[model samples]
Target: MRLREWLIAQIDSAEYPGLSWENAEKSMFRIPWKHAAKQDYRQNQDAALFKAWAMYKGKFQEGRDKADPSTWKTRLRCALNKSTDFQEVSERSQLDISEPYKVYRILED
Candidate 1:
């Protein structure tokens, strides 16, 4: 049997071959951040999802096209800066971490 190899092979390498431990953890944390954004817009689920998806989509595309998986942190941070405004969904409320640096900071845990 290949000891210690099973778990090692389970990394999201197929999708992010060059991912780092910190960035992988940070990427998973973005889910909660998106959920918080969705909750912030209680009036519209579709709009909130769209906004979140758009932001993620842009980041993914950039990663797929211009950046390597190891650089996801920087790429995602940059995309968050240009992400869609919550006002497009509604003026009632907005996501707290709209800026790339802001979102990037929150994922430190």
Candidate 2:
């Protein structure tokens, strides 16, 4: 699960094991900070989403793999990033939060 680079860590330990909350970044995969914020507001829906949107307007963009575009890691990163651009389909709505998946997509905005 540690090898999966995202929810694997969380699911592998929902108590969010292995570290302090300050180092929580280790649990999830890399994503654009803006989109990450969008996902962060899951516990509260409503325009708080747009509040995230407003917070990181120009910075908003799908995550990517500058190192290797064809790899599964790259794909997963982008998929998670895009998920933040739209509304939630999953229960938590955060990218890489509620599931262990190689891929996911957000509805078009």
Best by TM-score: 2
lDDT of all predictions:
0.30, 0.31
Q: Give the least accurate 10-residue stretch of model 1, judged by summed lDDT.
A: 100-109
Model 1 lDDT at residue 60: 43
* Alpha-carbon RMSD, candidate 2: 14.2
Q: What are the per-residue Cα lDDT tens digits for candidate 1 across 42-88?
A: 31321232233334546445355653332443443344445432011
Which ten-residue region of model 2 has the weakest summed lDDT? 27-36
**Local error of candidate 2 at residue 2 (angstroms):** 19
- Residue 44, candidate 1: alpha-carbon lDDT: 36
Candidate 1 RMSD to the real structure: 16.2
Model 2 CA deviation exceeding 4 Å by range:
1-70, 85-109
Clash pairs, candidate 1, are: none
